[PDB]
Design a binder for this molecule. Structure first.
Ligand code: DCC
Ligand code: DAO
Lengths: 200, 195
């Protein structure tokens, strides 16, 4: 019973924090307000979430898990891997824009000077590995290079998504993020060098 | 000579005591100027790093334009540029890290100033020009845009390397960025390629 009670307590604290972050802002909301809203002590809030960003990482992990189900579902349905890739970035751009105010402070956590926290953020948001799953079928199809691992190429594309999304959210939210992510995808997938146009 | 005296004094304190630990007050004293005078030249400490970075880039720019002039192949010049960047980043990691972080300073005004002081993307675009003229680069993206994307990959790689994982071979990491962005992840196995 204690296990269930702890999971329930963590979820209530999580819900309480997300609502406050949404309604009043992430930076403006304190651990004491979250604790009060979830009916726990300030000390208990920290036992579950050592720092406020850990709450956002939990949300990000949830978002990524949904994207993982979606990607696996599409591949299983027989969608072309490249189209699944384009779709993923399209939805990533759309979702990032919808949740901009919550995701921005989350993105900075991946740049935390403290390496333990940067690593924690990285492990909670493994987009690189999800991309690698889409590249896999391409490698088996013989159209993907094999001098670099799937994980390394996936990591690279995810790193680009990260920098584009962060700069978009922090400095140029008026620009078209979907267009920017499509640019990253095309450039890394096809390269800057021209390719063969098939016969009509 | 005050701008140069301040820069020199600041770099020496950073060298001997550390960038984070050094204060404007100490730099001013070491350069024999008031704190007020120091700020006219450098509004904030990281601006000294931008000046340093801008100078390193100017050096690379000379070397690059020079090699192209003497007929070196564009791709080879690009390969050279990144070998140089990897080596330099490794040698000056402690001072370059806070500079890299200033590039993502939440304050848009500061982020912009940093970007404009360190235009690596524009230099890469200069190197791509001969390739554009040969007609072998896609035209749905400008040279500046593609060059800036390759510079972004250098930034991401260098920041990770310097802040979290210096055990990686940074030179190979940058060659990987170059290979992937130039050639793409998709194979190039046309039995009859162009050229
Ligand atoms: C909806 C919102 C979405 C939101 C989606 C958000 C996406 C964000 C994406 C990331 C954005 C950024 O990180 S921006 C960059 C700045 N931030 C960061 O880097 C985050 C913090 N970074 C780190 O903690 C580190 O750099 C890591 C964890 C990323 C990687 O470090 P690491 O694993 O020690 O080192 P790495 O170079 O990866 O691996 C070294 C060798 O170990 C090998 N190796 C592989 N597996 C293992 C293993 N099980 N056990 C031992 N070794 C292994 C690797 O193949 C490699 O071999 P070999 O081939 O080398 O010989
Ligand atoms: C020898 C070290 C030279 C360091 C040059 C740093 C250039 C950083 C460019 C960052 C571009 C960007 O992604 O905004």
């Amino acid at each position: 019973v204690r296990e269930y009670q702890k999971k329930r307590r963590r979820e209530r604290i999580f819900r309480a924090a997300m609502e406050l972050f949404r309604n009043r802002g992430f930076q403006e909301t304190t651990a004491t307000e979250i604790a009060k809203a979830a009916h726990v002590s300030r000390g208990t809030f920290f036992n579950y979430y050592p720092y406020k960003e850990a709450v956002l990482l939990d949300y990000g992990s949830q978002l990524l898990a949904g994207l993982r189900e979606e990607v696996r579902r599409l591949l299983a349905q027989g969608r072309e891997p490249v189209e699944v890739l384009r779709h993923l970035f399209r939805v990533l751009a759309e979702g990032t824009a919808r949740e901009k105010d919550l995701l921005l402070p989350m993105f900075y956590e991946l740049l935390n000077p403290d390496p333990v926290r940067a690593r924690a953020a990285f492990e909670a948001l493994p987009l690189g590995d999800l991309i690698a799953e889409i590249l896999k079928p391409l490698r088996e199809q013989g159209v993907l290079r094999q001098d670099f691992s799937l994980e390394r190429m996936g990591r690279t594309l995810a790193d680009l998504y990260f920098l584009s999304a962060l700069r978009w959210a922090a400095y140029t939210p008026g620009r078209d993020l979907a267009e920017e992510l499509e640019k990253n995808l095309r450039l890394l997938l096809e390269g800057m060098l021209v390719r063969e146009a098939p016969a009509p």
